[PDB]
Design a protein around this ligand. Structure first.
Ligand SMILES: CCCCCCCC/C=C\CCCCCCCC(=O)O[C@H](COC(=O)CCCCCCC/C=C/CCCCCCCC)COP(=O)(O)OCCN
Lengths: 71, 83
């Protein structure tokens, strides 16, 4: 006596279902990456230049200590 | 002018690795000849006293040889301190 009941889609329809490819760009330019790399290299070069010059001075100092102690 | 430009564009499009390798190699070859600090590197290598400095027998005719390490004569490393 009751209404026919069955598994049916809701009145209207269903919400849209996405299927298309979605790969966002999500990246920097090539120039920016290359510039960051070159700047990092230059900073490291300058720091290591100072450090190695100081190390050469220290090495000369201890070599002179040896020279003084040798006789 | 334009032929080499197109060749370099094609190389950058197809073989960036080889382009970078050749650029780095060329820079490494040519830049040291134009640097003013190469002589400083040579002098730093020369200024390292690996062995004992043997003193010279004084004969009264060496005005440019010190008689004590703290005497003003002889080489100076003041340039190295400020470098
Ligand atoms: C003066 C610098 C010299 C010293 C520095 C270099 C040290 C190390 C670099 C040399 C290593 C040897 C590299 C030998 C190159 C072989 C070329 C070749 O035949 O490869 C071609 C491909 O390469 C070519 O396209 C032929 C030559 C193209 C030009 C390559 C670079 C030439 C110079 C470009 C830059 C010049 C200098 C930089 C300036 C930049 C501008 C500001 C074949 O590719 P396949 O792997 O077989 O393909 C399989 C899949 N298809």
């Amino acid at each position: 006596a009751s209404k026919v009941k069955q598994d049916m889609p809701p009145p209207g329809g269903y919400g849209p279902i996405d299927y298309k490819r979605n790969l966002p760009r999500r990246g920097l330019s090539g120039y920016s990456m290359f510039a960051v790399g070159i700047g990092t290299l230059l900073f490291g070069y300058w720091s290591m230049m100072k450090w190695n010059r100081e190390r050469r001075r220290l090495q000369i100092e201890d070599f002179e200590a040896r020279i003084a102690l040798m006789p | 002018a334009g032929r080499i430009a197109s060749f370099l564009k094609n190389a950058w499009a197809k073989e960036p690795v080889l382009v970078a390798s050749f650029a780095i190699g060329g820079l490494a070859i040519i830049l040291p000849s134009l640097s003013p600090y190469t002589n400083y590197a040579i002098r730093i290598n020369r200024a390292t006293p690996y062995n004992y400095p043997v003193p010279l027998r004084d004969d009264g005719n060496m005005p440019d040889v010190p008689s004590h390490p703290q005497d003003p004569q002889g080489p100076s490393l003041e340039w190295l301190k400020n470098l």
